[PDB]
Curated annotation (Swiss-Prot), chain C:
Biased composition (Basic residues): 6-15
Biased composition (Polar residues): 24-33
Any Gene Ontology biological process: translation
Lineage: Bacteria, Pseudomonadati, Pseudomonadota, Gammaproteobacteria, Moraxellales
Keywords from the named record: Ribonucleoprotein, Ribosomal protein
Organism for this UniProt entry: Acinetobacter baumannii (strain AB0057)
Region annotation Disordered: where it falls in the sequence: 1-43
Tagged with keyword Ribosomal protein: yes
Protein's gene: rpmF
Pfam families: Ribosomal_L32p (PF01783)
Family indicated by similarity: Belongs to the bacterial ribosomal protein bL32 family.
GO cellular component, one term: large ribosomal subunit
Any GO MF annotation of the entry: structural constituent of ribosome
Name this polypeptide is given: Large ribosomal subunit protein bL32
S-S bridge residues: none
From Swiss-Prot, chain D:
Protein name, per record: Large ribosomal subunit protein bL21
Role summary: This protein binds to 23S rRNA in the presence of protein L20.
Presence of keyword Hydrolase: no
Superkingdom of origin organism: Bacteria
Lineage: Bacteria, Pseudomonadati, Pseudomonadota, Gammaproteobacteria, Moraxellales
Subunit architecture: Part of the 50S ribosomal subunit. Contacts protein L20.
InterPro entries: bL21-like, bL21-like_sf, Ribosomal_bL21, Ribosomal_bL21_CS
Family, similarity comment: Belongs to the bacterial ribosomal protein bL21 family.
GO CC annotations, alphabetized: cytoplasm; ribonucleoprotein complex; ribosome
Organism expressing this protein natively: Acinetobacter baumannii (strain AB0057)
Keywords, in A-Z order: Ribonucleoprotein, Ribosomal protein, RNA-binding, rRNA-binding
GO MF term set: rRNA binding; structural constituent of ribosome
UniProtKB/Swiss-Prot annotation, chain E:
Family: Belongs to the universal ribosomal protein uL13 family.
Listed GO CC annotations: cytosolic large ribosomal subunit
Protein name: Large ribosomal subunit protein uL13
Domain of life: Bacteria
Signal peptide feature range: none
SUPFAM superfamilies hit by this protein: Ribosomal protein L13 (SSF52161)
Annotated function: This protein is one of the early assembly proteins of the 50S ribosomal subunit, although it is not seen to bind rRNA by itself. It is important during the early stages of 50S assembly.
GO terms for biological process, alphabetical: negative regulation of translation; translation
Molecular function, one GO term: structural constituent of ribosome
Amino acid sequence: ARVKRGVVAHRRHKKILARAKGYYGARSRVYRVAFQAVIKAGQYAYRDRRQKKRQFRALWIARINAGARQNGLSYSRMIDGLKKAQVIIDRRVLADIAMHDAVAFAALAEKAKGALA
Amino acid sequence: MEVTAKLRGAAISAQKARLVADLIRGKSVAHALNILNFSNKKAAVLVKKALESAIANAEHNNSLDVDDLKVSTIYVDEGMSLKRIMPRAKGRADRITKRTCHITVKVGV
Amino acid sequence: AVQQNRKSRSRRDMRRSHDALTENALTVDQATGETHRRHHVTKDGFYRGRQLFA
Amino acid sequence: MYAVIQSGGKQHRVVEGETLKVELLKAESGATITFDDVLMVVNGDNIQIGAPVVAGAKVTAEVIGHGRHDKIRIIKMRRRKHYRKQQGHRQWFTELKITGISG
Amino acid sequence: MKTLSAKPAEVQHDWFVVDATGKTLGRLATEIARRLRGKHKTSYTPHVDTGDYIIVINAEQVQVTGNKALDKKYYRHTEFPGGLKETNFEKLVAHKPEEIFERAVKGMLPKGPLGYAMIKKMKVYAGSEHPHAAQQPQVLDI
RNA sequence: GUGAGGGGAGUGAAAUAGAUCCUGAAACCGCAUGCAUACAAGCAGUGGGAGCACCUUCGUGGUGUGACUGCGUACCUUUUG
RNA sequence: GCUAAAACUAUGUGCCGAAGCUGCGGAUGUAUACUUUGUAUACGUGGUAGGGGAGCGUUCUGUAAGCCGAUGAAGGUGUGU
C-alpha cells in the first residue's frame, strides 16, 4: 500500500505561502523563509494584543492632562477630585469628552475642584 | 486590434535582446525601422525581421495601413537552453549553458 | 574573495540601471532624400553632392 | 443630546439612532433593553453629571441580534526548546440600536 | 474606533514669540519642546504634529547657573582620525546662540522624521527683531 | 535566405490537442495597470494610522497601496549558558 | 539638561506603573450536589527529558452489480464560509 505525499504536501505549502503574501523578497516566495515569517508574525500579534491596552491608556491620560491644564488643574489633582466627588466615568470617555466638547469638560473640572475644596 | 508576430528560438540571450526591445518599445514603425537599420547590435537584425513580419501580417491578413502603425507591444522571453562541457585545468570540468530567446511584437493603430 | 550572501534581484536591477542603449544621429541627405547617418556617406556612395562609384 | 452608559464592564457614549456592539447579552433578538444607571447626560448647555448615577435618566435600545467577531490566531513558540501551540478564537457580541434617551 | 486621531489637514499651527532675556536655558527648553510637540492640546496624537510655531528673540542673553558658563563643553567630531573639536558655553553663545538653542531643543525632542519636522517650527534670532511680522505672532511668557 | 520561425486559410468535438504535441504545479525570468519611494540608519514584521485609485447596497462598506508612529537582534542542533 | 534643584536628609498628600488582583464574555481537567441525563458549585489549566489520554488527514480491502459523473470525475488555479 504505497502512499504518495504530493497533494497533501502541496496543499500545506500553498496555505503557508498564501498566509505569507505581502512580504518582501524571499519571505513571500520561498517556503523555508516564509514559514519562519508567519510564526514570528503570530508571536508579535500575541505580544501586541497586550501592548495595545497600555498604549491607549497612555493616550487617554495625555489628552485628559491637556484638558485639565487648560481648565487650571493637573491630571492627578483632577483624578483625585473626581474620585472624591464619586464620579465613576472612565478615562476613555473623559478623553473623548475633552477632545470633542470643551464646555462639558470644564463643568467636570469645576466639579472636581469643588470636591477638592 | 493588434497584429502579432513571434520569432521563437533565436540564438541569443534574452538579456541582450531586451536592450534593443526597450530601445524600440512604443515608437512608430518607420522610426523603429530606421533605428534598427542603423544599429550595430546582433539582436537588432532579429528584432527587425520580427517587426517586418508583423507589419506584413497586418498589411496582408488584416487590410491595415502601415502609415498609422506603431509598436504597440513587445517583449522577449527565455527559451530552451543547450548544455555543453568546457574542460578546465587539472582535469576539472565546467557546465556551459547556451541560451535562446523568443521575441514577441504586436503592432496596432 | 567571494560573496557571503546572495545578492537580491532588486540590487541586481539597481546595478543594471545604467545599461540602457541610445540612438544614433540620423538625418536626411538633401541630394537623394534617403535617411542616412550624419557625416557619413550614404549606402549608395553619395555624399555632399558627389558620387564615388559609377 | 448624548448620554454615557455602562455595559459589559465598559462605558460608551451614545446618541439616538446609533448602532453599537457590546458583550453577549442574554436578551432575545428584537427585544428592548433599558439602562437606568446613566452616568452623564448632555443636552446643549444642560449638563447632568450623576455622581454615581443621574436620577431619572433612562436610555432605551433594541437588540438587533448576536454574532461573532473575525477569527484571531494564537501562536506560542519557544525557540530551541521543541515546543509549539496554536488555537483560534472568535468573541461573541450583541448588537444594539439606541432608540430613546431621556434625562 | 470610538477613539480618534487628529487629521494633519485639519491641524492649525499658531504663532508665538518668546523673549529669552534672563531666563534659564533648560527650563525654557522644556516648555519650548512641549509646545513644539503639541502636548498642550486635547487633540494630541503621537504620530501627528500638532504643535505651534515658536519664535525666540534675544537668544544671546540666555543664562546658566554655577560655573557652567565657563565649564560647559560642546564637542563635535570630524570623522578624520584625531578630529575632535571642543568649545565652551561663553564662546558659543557669543558666536552662534542659534546652535545653543538647537542643541537644547533637539536633545529634548524625539529622534526621527517627525522630530526633524517638528524642530523646523522654531525660529531663533540673536537680536530683538524678527522677520515674521506677516504671521502676526503673539507674546507668550514662558 | 526557396533557412528557421510565424500570420491567415482549411481539418478536428477540442490546435496555449501542431508533432520532446494529455493535464502543465514550484523555484526562476518578462510585459501591463494602481498605490508608495531620491533628508533618511539595523531579522524587514507586528499594534495603531492619514492620504490615494477602483468597486460600490455609496455604509460605521469592500478590494489594492501604506506617508507618519510605539514595540521588536532569524531557524535547527548542542549546551551551565 | 539640572544649583532656595530636576542633588542629599526627614515628613505629608496625590498620581503613574505588570500577562499581579478586580470587572464583562468564552473554553476546558478533577471532585462534589441535583441522588437518571448535563446542569450548577469548588479548585485548577507556564513548562525541557519523559509518562498518560483524545483526534485530523493519505493509499488499499469489504459494505459496492450500491451512490455521484460528458447537463463534466480526479487533478490545477481563485473566491466565500
